[model samples]
Target: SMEQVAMELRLTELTRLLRSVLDQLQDKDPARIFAQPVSLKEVPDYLDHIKHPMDFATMRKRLEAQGYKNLHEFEEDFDLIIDNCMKYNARDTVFYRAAVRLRDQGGVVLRQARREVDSIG
Candidate 1:
């Protein structure tokens, strides 16, 4: 019983720490959002959807309808998104590495994520 309780408490603590870390890392940075070479026009639209809170399926549909059909579509837009994410949220090595990798790919992420999601489904 003691070991079980300790295990449960440890799990809870790990969950909280992990969640907090994720939240901080994912915080959006406005400046970074538009800093990349791409147009900033779609950001407002993207944020608007986030503010209103649409489900994943609906959000994907809306993005596709709006013509952000692939990660490449949003790839150029992510430097700013990463910047904004860093700006608003806490910073971590993950975000830094991700931003760099994303930029280097030059939009391949869009295609990859799409394929990955398709495969999982």
Candidate 2:
């Protein structure tokens, strides 16, 4: 029981770490677009531009299923979400700005989470 507690503690910490980033991401957007998934209905040709797309709903859903063990795999999707946003939206667009904005704020947290790993490891 005692040895398992260490594993459980680390597991819960990882979930909270992931959740914190999602919380900040959802809060940063004003249009409520961040809460849901993206689709072709809003913008045609979007499907072609981004073969691999991601959004808060879809990412959060996958994260909730607890599919990640390594931080880097989870890291890929967050960057991908913004990378896809930048491609589909214009440089000066509202959504584009949000991605760049989050690219830093979430950026800080991700590196910080990585720091936690480095510190303990």
Candidate 3:
């Protein structure tokens, strides 16, 4: 029980920290999307919000809706994103591991999203 509570708390802290960094990024990029920071803590808050495959699915659908032409071309882009997320939370092992899993699954979702885009067009 302690570990679970601690893990959840750790995830919450990680999510908050990531949101702060994302906020900073938004200042620079100015074209940010996503309704909110999808944190590991919120994984359970929403159904099918686990760090894995679901994150990939969520992002894929979101990007597709936003009209990103190359949903398939998201590989390099997501790699960079994962790279940045890892760097953004470099000190936290839990966050890093969780992010790594999410990114890997993202690769799969990218393909699926691309398919959806293709089917529509």
TM-score of each: 0.27, 0.78, 0.36
Tens digit of per-residue lDDT, candidate 3, span 57-100:
34445443432324334445455555655654554576566556
Q: What ordering of candidates by lDDT runs from best to worst?
A: 2, 3, 1
**Candidates arranged by TM-score, highest first:** 2, 3, 1
Candidate 3 ranges beyond 4 A from true positions: 1-81
CA displacement after TM-score superposition, residue 24 of candidate 1 (Å): 0.6
- lDDT at position 6, candidate 2: 85
- Candidate 1 local accuracy as lDDT? 0.41
**Whole-model Cα lDDT of every candidate shown, in order:** 0.41, 0.76, 0.45
Q: Which ten residues in a row have the lowest lDDT in candidate 2?
A: 26-35
Best by lDDT: 2
Candidate 3: Cα lDDT at 66: 39
lDDT of 1 at 95: 47
- Quote the positional error of residue 45 for candidate 1 in Å: 26
Local error of candidate 3 at 12, Å?
Answer: 34
